[PDB]
Symmetry: C3
Subunit: 349 residues, 3 copies
Amino acid sequence: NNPYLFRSNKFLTLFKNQHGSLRLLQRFNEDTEKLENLRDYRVLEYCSKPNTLLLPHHSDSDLLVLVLEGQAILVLVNPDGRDTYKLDQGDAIKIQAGTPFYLINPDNNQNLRILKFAITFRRPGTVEDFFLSSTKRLPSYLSAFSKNFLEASYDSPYDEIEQTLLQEEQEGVIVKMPKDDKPFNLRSRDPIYSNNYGKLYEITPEKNSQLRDLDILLNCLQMNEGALFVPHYNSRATVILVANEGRAEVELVGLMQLRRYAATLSEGDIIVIPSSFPVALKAASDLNMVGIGVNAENNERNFLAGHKENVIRQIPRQVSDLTFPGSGEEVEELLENQKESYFVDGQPR
Amino acid sequence: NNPYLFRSNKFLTLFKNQHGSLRLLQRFNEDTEKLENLRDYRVLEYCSKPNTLLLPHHSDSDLLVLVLEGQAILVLVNPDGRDTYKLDQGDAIKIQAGTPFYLINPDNNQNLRILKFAITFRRPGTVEDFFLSSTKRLPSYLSAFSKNFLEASYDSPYDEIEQTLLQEEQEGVIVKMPKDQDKPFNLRSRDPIYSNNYGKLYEITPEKNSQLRDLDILLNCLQMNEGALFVPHYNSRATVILVANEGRAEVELVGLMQLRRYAATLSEGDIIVIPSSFPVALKAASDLNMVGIGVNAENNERNFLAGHKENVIRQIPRQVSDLTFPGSGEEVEELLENQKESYFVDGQPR
Amino acid sequence: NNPYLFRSNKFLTLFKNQHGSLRLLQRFNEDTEKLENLRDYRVLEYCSKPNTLLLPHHSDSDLLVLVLEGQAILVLVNPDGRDTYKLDQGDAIKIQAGTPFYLINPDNNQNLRILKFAITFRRPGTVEDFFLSSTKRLPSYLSAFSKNFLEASYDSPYDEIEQTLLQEEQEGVIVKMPDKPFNLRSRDPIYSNNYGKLYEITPEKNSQLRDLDILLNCLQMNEGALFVPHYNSRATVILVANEGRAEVELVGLMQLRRYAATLSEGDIIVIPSSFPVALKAASDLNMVGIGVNAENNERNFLAGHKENVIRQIPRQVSDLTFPGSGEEVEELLENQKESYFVDGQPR
């Protein structure tokens, strides 16, 4: 029906128990040619309950980890030592491929919800995880080696090695904790658009060294019920837009023939907004959303309504008069009606 | 039959009326595996008559715009203001994806002929254009939005909005202008890299021009006299899309399992693709000028197999020549010394 | 069965005579989707006997040339002049695409064995060579041009041109004779104990490699030695058995699979990024590694004292991850004293 829309039911449950869930969005190009440009990227949700640990693993892929809800303790293990980070809501960090990490929800009441955005390069489109832990679904990758190699390696009898590393200890890879460069925040900077209806924060690869490497931008969209993000488009960034809280009425325009792709988004729903496609966004409730833009370097946002950054207002009358049915002045007058910019009252009068 | 040849009839007419035409060359990889390296690029012709306007639109693709014939006024609109450029014949400029522009042929007699070279990145191989204009073939992309959103957006009744923006005024996206009235750069802005009595070749490399560095492209303007021959050579890295602009060219291309020769006579509007490392030679049937667009251009080097200057065979020592070739070392060295001129030579039969 | 394994018989013999052979490994992705990441690269052997010449040609591809055995005289022809290089065993150089070169084995007794690693960009996965020489298998690419163009070009009669350039002189492309290169072992080895050395040039350290985003390593091990379980973060390494025989255990993936194999002279195993790998020397062996996606690569070990990531996991977390008590784990990882290379002899 709409190829740019990924309902929260298009997520595959990789793992689940009473402690938390790991879910994996289908390939962007599983169902359509129109997203060949995204085939290298995958999205994952990690919901975990209080006082949980995600057992040590490494990914074959680079991860952009982004805390939507709650607080987390991330530990990266390198051959040398280990780095520990408290991530609060809105914090993001890049976990290099090959780095072994584990994740803790310390809060005694607050759930944890984390968005992983995997950049694949080994096998494009596919994310493999390597867990050290023998569990029910899967054993330790150490167990894959022969009796000889393991014994020679650790200078130990296989019986010691098996009873100490390789036997199945835990049921799952999310377990209960005993009954008891750096990260950066989306909203660490001042919002690039901010009036009485909405804020939009944005970190660009131009401004953050972790993102320059990935050629990604992140933005945090906040709006009030009834507010409208007026028609605009990005020059370069293809933005994967994730409904975090609230419901959003989205209208997307594209193309042969002129097509309109509208949808109402609930918590967990994703729409892909290609570069140069005009888009508008009404808040059905107070909502915040999180955007991940690829091909982000040099991105520029052109508006088609409101006072500020309205490209149509920069078209001279002599040209307007020819382009449009209205006279040059008739057009210029209609564009001056709307006083606010970016975010406006989207309520029927 | 010849997969590197794109006749002028391989262009699809996107739009046409009595004011001008916009045409679009088929994908380079539509008909052969042999051009996978070009699948991200598309070529377009814009021929427009005097005192015409191309209505405001933006592309999803980066455009390299290049004026073959005439003069034009290009206006790039940004959210901040707008930039205006006079393009004369041989002028080129990069139009960023997402930039809304319009194009005017002001000359009261001279036609306008422009080459668009689209670098695609959103949907590889595909160029979409977004026109603000309600026309016969297509309505404004603004019209696509709901009655609610449009009204809320412009703070106006839909009646006003439809009559002012969305109603069809113009018949086409090329319209006649009313009666009673970084920066661009020229191919020939530098000195030609090869220049004798038979031919000139101008060349801008990404090494020398910041707009091209980004695209990893080179442009060259080839001029030759009837009967002149561009002697056998090849590029190391650059795969050149070669556009017959004026005159007719006898072209011999050598390639590969099996050894093949891909020859053809080229007319105004014809294109041949000359892969990297493929030996190529080119005789002028008439006085011709051509335009070259080379991809993978960074660090390109041109090796010749004939003439005095830059003839790689002349750099092979006699001891090795004698083994490589049937002739004695000296017999070879003597034969390569015969041809006195370089690059461009007399191509006339004796 | 094992898609990462390329036996020496999987090389296609492009040309052969009593003077030498040119052989070309099948596409990495011919038979499996699991190596999409390598589809731009091709491997070749050039084995030539003493006092031989490889006739002047240019490639459509960038070549990383690497001398496994013997010594060679490489001549690169540019439009201006020519550069001549003596390569000794272990020497490597990048021959840019389009550069015409020829190759000589001057030694009166030693064979020449060269590993060519082609980086393809024109037609991805395909290497074309363009020989100036008329031979039995193929004529000079000059012969392709018309009588007119050739005559006009060299300002000479076709008779002279044909008898001097275009006629078949030689039987084959290997005939009997009448910036700078760098050695794998030019630096100090990054790992060195009583069982093994590993040399490694990274793109970080060598500007010829920075361009190609490649690392090279020279692995030397003593019979019975074991390269303990490790993985690279980013580099996918094409591993070439040069001398000796190696037991290789490679672990990967929906299902957990082990890809073991015994490798002989000429055999290649591809070791993906993030796949744990271990390697026992059945005999004294040396191998050559070509790692792609090499920029910023990091090697994490799962056994031995130094650079063992499992040792950096704290007890409190270990206790949960593994069946053993925190200290049971900590103690077991302390048993093995040496690092990287260990005694692989069974108790």
